[PDB]
Ligand binder design. Structure first.
Ligand SMILES: CC(=O)Nc1cccc(C(=O)O)c1C
Ligand SMILES: CC(=O)Nc1cccc(C(=O)O)c1C
Lengths: 412, 412
């Protein structure tokens, strides 16, 4: 048997807002965070738009000196983490610092830093590479820097499971607390891949929407005219906490993390199976982990990335796991509004799933103008839907066929 | 209730050879795998030597067609993984494929591929970025590709905890099996950071030995004339397996994995505390996890990277954890011979720790000509030591202050 895990703090940078409540207001109003990308020449690229974090002020969190040493994805992850810890009200002491850890991950990490240092290396040679290039670029430095700044001496790691990273980071943090390896974890992910190599890389695989003329309409999960995902930047972080620890200090509890599932498709490098059999097993695993019948699920935050093969495979998976109940639950992709934050997608979508529980409302899938063949579930087309939500699922699936499901429940 | 975990398979690429037994014979002969680097021109760099994998033939595992699409670190991880799985004698069936997962990590992952695509982007433009740049370079794709080739549908993820990756990967995979999430895991790491950004980046931070005149003498843990670590390439993979599962199929058991510890220094991004307080917390966590009296520890495979601050800190933590018993155990750094495989360091070192148990021999710390002040333990200077080993401990420390300890014992 196993300790209960609750959510006491949340923090976020997204294309919709510089914090959770601004982002969540965006979500419920159906607002897009997608725009042509600025201060960067995309003439030669097939995709010129994405979800940028707008007006980020790193000096609310770090000195100019510390910020200069760190890739944007690390800055974004620390901002989300500080917000989350602040939101939790947690006081770190000598009594508890050994019981507080971090698992903040990234899918692709320091690409902007790697770009900038590559320029220096090619143009001038290795003597112009920054001394902080290595520590300032590696994916575990959100966990590293946060632990140094707050004096966190608990489990310290980072997951990198491509587009599953955020979901996996929160799940494995939850396991640390459940099995008594920590009382508190800060978990989630951060990503900044809106550079040459990210838009170029995903663009070369023709994975991206090229709807340059209508950026806010590019991300249209399960719509018949979808043409690939929209690349987005940001971060999400949650304070996970053992229930008796939260209660003792009178912490405000948002929701309970009751279920985590994992699976591998063992199918293709960059496409799921057509029936989404891996997604199905992962969702099944998460529900068994929670001791929940598929019947109990009210809301699914879909992976729902606006790809042809991806979107249909997730519908097939949900129909398989849930049967006739798949038509009674509400499923939406918030990527319709935020785009695809890759490694940070599972973190910000775990937060939206928790807020769907707090506010009893399913966020919309915007741009769902003509549902494709088979896309006949309640996909919350166009507008937010107030409704009863006791249990909310959040799916992430990644290159390599790596799948993650979180199950959240209302607490009382 | 927590299940017992054993090692049934091991695989390796190292600077000492292209499998486990060849690598192991080099370790016991006191052989160095460190040489001037031949694959690039480094006349502009302050470090012009490393531990390269010599004569690696990827077409012993994969078609040339697939190999071409994959960064060396992925090639190296799959090679070590395929060896470990072969060595286990495990058969993947529809009955067990959902119970077999993989956690192979990397510190930096596809940096050679990323640099090469960065050259294309800057010299030509984004149109020359390979369509395989993302799935051929990101860290989670050892786990991805291995699951695709072998049909593994169990937990599928990657850690990135810098030079601690391999230790954390094995540790966390063991926890998956211990807590019932899988019956088998392929776990370890792989690294190939010997490109312009890698040697230039660590050089810029002055982390590397610059002993170009005698590359084989550069890696000299606890020697008073050490001047930084030696950058090394390779992969270690282990098959971890629930004890009853292994017994049930008549598996050859190398050793039991009895202990796993984690901790954060919460001190500095790129140096340990002088007293190795974080290392000490980690080893105590692992010894407690294993239910051991610290006096049962016979052999320690040190992190022992040949850095001024790092080597002395590890002595301090061992003296702090074992008191007078520090003078009875044997502690050696195989990095004296292999150099520093970064994310793969913990993976090849876990393997050398299990082989120390199989063969009852402490591997040498070669090049320990003049042990530094306070470095007065049995550091197995120069020559392999035959001795009683029931319990072996392997340490890894990483940028961010992220620590890991594994404890293995002989299985009867
Ligand atoms: C194996 C696979 O490609 N799974 C999957 C399914 C749907 C969307 C996405 C995506 O995040 O773009 C991914 C990665
Ligand atoms: C926080 C820190 O820098 N720890 C540590 C200690 C000793 C060696 C090494 C290494 O791999 O060179 C590291 C990374």
């Amino acid at each position: 048997s196993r300790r209960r895990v609750v959510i006491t703090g949340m923090g976020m940078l997204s294309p919709l807002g510089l914090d959770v409540p601004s982002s969540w207001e965006g979500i419920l109003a159906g607002r897009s965070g997608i725009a042509p990308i600025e201060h960067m020449d995309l003439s030669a690229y097939s995709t010129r738009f994405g979800g940028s974090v707008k007006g980020f002020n790193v000096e609310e969190y770090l000195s100019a000196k510390e910020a200069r040493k760190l890739d944007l994805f690390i800055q974004y992850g620390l901002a989300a983490s500080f917000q989350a810890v602040r939101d939790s009200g947690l006081e770190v002491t000598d009594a508890n610092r050994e019981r507080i850890g971090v698992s903040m991950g990234s899918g692709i990490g320091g690409l902007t830093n790697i770009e900038n240092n590559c320029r220096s290396l090619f143009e001038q040679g290795p003597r112009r590479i920054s001394p902080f290039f290595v520590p300032g670029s590696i994916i575990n430095m959100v966990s590293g820097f946060l632990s140094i700044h707050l004096g966190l001496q608990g489990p310290n790691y980072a997951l990198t499971t491509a587009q599953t990273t955020g979901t996996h980071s929160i799940g494995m943090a939850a396991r640390n607390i459940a099995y008594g390896e920590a009382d508190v974890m800060v978990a989630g992910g951060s990503e900044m891949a809106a550079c040459g190599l990210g838009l170029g890389g995903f663009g070369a695989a023709r994975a991206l929407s090229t709807r340059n003329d209508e950026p806010t309409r590019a991300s249209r999960p399960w719509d018949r005219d979808r043409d690939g995902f929209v690349l987005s930047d940001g971060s999400g972080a949650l304070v996970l906490e053992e229930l008796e620890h939260a209660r003792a200090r009178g912490a405000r509890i948002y929701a309970e993390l009751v279920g985590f599932g994992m699976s591998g498709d063992a199918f293709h490098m960059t496409a799921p199976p057509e029936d989404g059999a891996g997604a199905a097993r992962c969702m099944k695993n998460a529900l068994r982990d929670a001791g929940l019948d598929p019947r109990q699920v009210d809301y699914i935050n879909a992976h729902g990335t606006s790809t042809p093969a991806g979107d249909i495979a997730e519908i097939a998976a949900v129909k398989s796991v849930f049967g006739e109940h798949a038509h009674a639950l509400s499923m939406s992709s918030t990527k319709s509004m935020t785009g695809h934050l890759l490694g940070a997608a599972g973190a910000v979508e775990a937060i939206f799933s928790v807020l769907a529980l707090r506010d009893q409302v399913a966020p919309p899938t915007i741009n769902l103008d003509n549902p494709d063949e088979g896309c006949d579930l309640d996909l919350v087309a166009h507008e937010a839907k107030p409704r009863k939500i006791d249990v909310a699922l959040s799916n992430s699936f990644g290159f390599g066929g790596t799948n993650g499901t979180l199950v959240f429940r209302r607490f009382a």
